[PDB]
Structure 1
């Protein structure tokens, strides 16, 4: 859907900004510093679920740029494993949110965060 590779970069960076905000805005809730409203979090995690699928389609062939390492492309199956682990952990976060349990939410949240970092460590430029 991108006229030029720059447009894929812009898209993925914007998708990531959104995803990161819908993830990170729950940090005070999982830490107990903000109240836990099960319906509020369930709705937010449904947004996050949609957003979490969007970046990966904007690393198509030819869309090198931004802070993406070239190894994303050179090792496409390996990158896909990092993406899949992350998406599987989002499924578990959805489950915890749907169950309305803060202890399960905080565990699932931490698993997602670990998956974010693992992909960055391999595939995001310093």
Structure 2
């Protein structure tokens, strides 16, 4: 769907921006600094679920640029393992949110955050 590689870069960066907001806005809830409303979090995690499927198709052939490392493309199976494992972590977060289980939500939130960081550490330029 991208006319030029720059359009793929713009897309995936914007997807990252929105994920960071929908993930990070739950930090005060996880920490107990903001109240836990199960329905609010369930709805927010649904949005995050949708968003977290979006970046990967915007690292398609010929879309090199931005702060994306070339090893994303030269090690395609490995990058794919990381995005699939991340999306698995999001499924765990969705299950916790859908159950209304705050302890499960805390734990799953931490594992999602670790998955974001692990990919950025390997595949995003500093």
Is TM more than 0.5 here? yes
Identify the residue that residue 11 of structure 1 maps to in structure 2.
Answer: 11
Separation in 2 of the partners of 1:120 and 1:97? 25
How far, CA to CA, are the matches of 1:112 and 1:89 in structure 2? 5
Counterpart-to-counterpart distance in 2, 1:78 and 1:18: 24
Distance in 2, matches of 1:120 and 1:5, equals: 20
- Following the alignment from structure 1 to structure 2, what is the Cα–Cα distance between the partners of residues 118 and 19? 15
Corresponding residue for 2:60?
60
Structure 1 ranges of 4+ moved more than 4 A = none
Q: How far has the Cα of 1:32 moved from its partner?
A: 0.2
* Alpha-carbon distance in structure 2 between the residues aligned to 1:82 and 1:12: 16
Figure out how many residues of one structure are paired with residues of the other and give that number: 126
Q: TM-score, normalised by structure 2?
A: 0.99
Deviation at 1:25, TM superposition (A): 0.3
Instruction: Provide the residue aligned with 1:42 in structure 2.
Output: 42
Displacement of 1:121 in angstroms is: 1.1
CA distances 1:39-83 after superposition (whole Å, capped 9, x unpaired): 000000000000000000100010000000000000000000110
Q: Which runs of 5+ in 1 are unaligned?
A: none
Task: Report how far residue 101 of structure 1 moved.
Answer: 1.0
Q: Give SS of 1:29's match.
A: helix
In the superposition, the TM-score normalised over structure 1's length comes to 0.99
Deviation of 1:107 after TM superposition, in Å, equals 0.2
Whole-Å separation in 2 of the counterparts to 1:4 and 1:104: 42
What is the Cα deviation at residue 98 of structure 1? 0.3
- Cα deviation, residue 91, structure 1: 0.3
Q: Does structure 1 residue 103 correspond to structure 2 residue 103?
A: yes
Q: Distance in 1 between matches of 2:104 and 2:122?
A: 28
**CA RMSD after TM alignment:** 0.4
